Every structure is written in C-alpha cells, then in structure tokens.
Write a protein that binds this ligand. Structure first.
Ligand SMILES: O=C(O)CC[C@H]1COc2c(ccc(CNCc3ccccc3C(=O)NCc3ccccc3)c2C(=O)O)O1
Ligand SMILES: O=C(O)CC[C@H]1COc2c(ccc(CNCc3ccccc3C(=O)NCc3ccccc3)c2C(=O)O)O1
Ligand SMILES: [Cl-]
Ligand SMILES: [Cl-]
Ligand SMILES: [Cl-]
Lengths: 149, 149
C-alpha cells in the first residue's frame, strides 16, 4: 500500500494533464504535456520515482501499459508496472471526482497565471494541502514513515 | 528544520541545473533549465512547495533573492524567502560536494539518455536512494513525519 501509485490522464485547453495519485493518501503530482506519449509518460515516472518510493504503478491506459519506453522507465526506476483495470469499481469514481476537483481548482486560479502549467502546479499545491482533518501531504508522509519503521 | 530548503544552481553542457536541497536530510529535487531566470526559479519553487511542506527557502544568489517573481512565488506558496549567506562555512562545502557528486552520477548515466534532463532525473533518483544506513529519501519522510507527530 505505501508504494502504490495510479496514473491518470485528463484534458484541458487542448492540452494533456498527466497525474500520478498515491492511492492510500490521495496525494498527487502532475504535469502539463502537449500529448500523452510513452516518452512523456516514461520521463514523468522517472521523476516521480526519484522523489517518492514508487513500488507499483497502475498505468492509466493500455498504450502506456504496452509502451516499451514506459516499460524501460519502470525497469530503470525499479517500478512494478501494472494495468489499471478497476476491479474495485469505486476506483473509477474516485479518479473521475479527482479530475473534476482538479479542473475546478484550475478554474479558481486560472487568472493568476498566463500559462496552464502554472495553474496546474497551483492546483497540485491546493489539492495536497487541503484538509479533509489531515491533508494528503500529511497522509503520504505518515504512511511512508510508518512503513519505514 | 523540517521545512528548511536551500536552492543551488550548477552548470553542465552549457545548461543550468537548478537544485533544491532539504537541508536536514540531503534529499533533493532538480530540473534542467536553459538559464536561471526569476521566472524559472519561481515556477520551480511553486512545484516544490506543492510536493513538500516548504516553510523556508534559502535562495541560491542575490538575483533570485531580489526577484519580484520569486518573491511572488514565495508569497503564493507560503514560503519564507531568505538569503543564502553561509554563516556556517560548512554550508559551502556541503553544496559544493553535492554538486560534484551529482555531476559524477550524471557522467555515470550520461550514455543511458540522449537528453541531459533525463540524466539529471536519474541522478536525482540515485542520490535520493543512496544509503549512507538510511537514504536521504527515508530521512526526509522520517523528519517530516516526526514533525507532524
Ligand atoms: O520530451 C518528452 O517526451 C519527455 C522528455 C524526454 C527526455 O528524454 C528522454 C525521455 C524519456 C526517455 C529517454 C530515454 N530514451 C531512450 C534511450 C536513449 C539513449 C540511450 C538509452 C535510452 C534508453 O532506452 N534508456 C533507458 C531508459 C528509458 C526510459 C527511462 C529511463 C531509462 C529520454 C532520453 O533519451 O533522454 O523523456
Ligand atoms: O518558462 C519559465 O520560466 C518557467 C515556466 C513559467 C510558466 O508560467 C509562469 C511561470 C512563473 C510565474 C508565472 C506567473 N506569472 C505572473 C502572472 C501572470 C498573470 C497573472 C498573474 C501573475 C502573477 O504574478 N501570479 C502570481 C504568482 C507569481 C509567481 C508564482 C506564482 C504565482 C507564470 C505564468 O504566468 O503562468 O513559470
Ligand atoms: Cl494525447
Ligand atoms: Cl548556487
Ligand atoms: Cl544562467
């Protein structure tokens, strides 16, 4: 559980927002990319795994699951690459609701930045700091620290 | 101490590597940029603060300390912007040694990537996972978790 992440890709302003969600905490990292290629996904995973102890990644779609470049990144970073089939149907709803929430926040900050990438990073900040009462940022650290201990 | 970060800028292949160091743990995040502008530094800090609980940032130089855009990012993200004067002279040596280490690792992986940005993210991964015996990644999580209580 401490090392499980889920990839998620959503669209806004004719651009792609690639998101990684730490499943147990709801903590996210995200980036704006022109399009969702294996190369972009691979680079994103390399960054993620250098920053958090990523054991397992549930890929967002079959193309990224298939991608040799994504597989190569997972090999390099010591990540178990898995599919993203929602065996638990609640997974769908959670990701869908998160995408809605992220887009809402982006709208709330959109006039504070010229570029979408900036608005997305503001949304990441707000999402991770939001108290629901602990924040997702507090939860991920506590979960991982407990695992280390 | 749990929320204290230091900025660091080093050069390689005619490009700029911007690094943030969590002082207490030695954990880093880094990016390659064409040049070190206030705008680039501001965006980097916005990303960092969305991902870790950044209380204080010691800026890497006077230009970034002065930069209204950097000040605006620190305001936005709730970061205390400070100077980077090494009142403790050991600070210099530590940053210098880290830059040497990072460049060494980049050299060790350089042929595994076409682009410097990729090599830098590999270096971030290796640096943060390296056992010195805990890793910097383990230390940062433990330090922050203990602070949260
Ligand atoms: O622009 C975007 O899409 C996002 C940015 C780009 C930045 O460059 C890259 C990138 C994504 C991937 C690579 C690796 N390329 C294959 C390669 C070229 C030359 C030598 C070896 C290899 C190799 O297979 N190594 C094993 C490996 C694969 C994937 C990840 C880590 C390690 C680059 C790069 O070559 O630098 O994302
Ligand atoms: O290319 C690079 O250098 C790195 C990428 C760029 C991507 O875009 C940006 C960036 C860095 C900064 C900004 C904000 N610009 C001022 C601005 C423009 C329009 C409206 C408001 C503001 C404003 O002052 N907001 C308060 C604020 C300032 C800095 C940081 C966060 C919040 C952008 C952007 O406008 O989107 O880094
Ligand atoms: Cl796409
Ligand atoms: Cl510096
Ligand atoms: Cl420069």
């Amino acid at each position: 559980s401490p090392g499980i992440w889920q990839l998620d890709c959503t669209h806004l302003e004719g651009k792609v927002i690639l998101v990684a969600v730490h499943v147990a905490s709801g903590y996210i990292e995200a980036e704006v990319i022109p399009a969702e290629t294996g190369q972009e996904t691979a680079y994103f995973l390399l960054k993620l795994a250098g920053r958090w102890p990523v054991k397992t990644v549930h890929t967002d779609n079959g193309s990224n699951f298939t991608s040799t470049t994504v597989k190569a990144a997972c090999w390099w970073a010591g990540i178990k690459q898995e599919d993203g089939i929602p065996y638990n149907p609640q997974s769908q709803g959670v990701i869908e609701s998160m995408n809605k929430e992220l887009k809402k926040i982006i709208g709330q900050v959109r006039d504070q930045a010229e570029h979408l990438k900036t608005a997305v990073q503001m949304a990441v900040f707000i999402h991770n700091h939001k108290r629901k009462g602990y924040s997702a940022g507090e939860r991920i650290v506590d979960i991982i620290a407990t695992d280390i201990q």
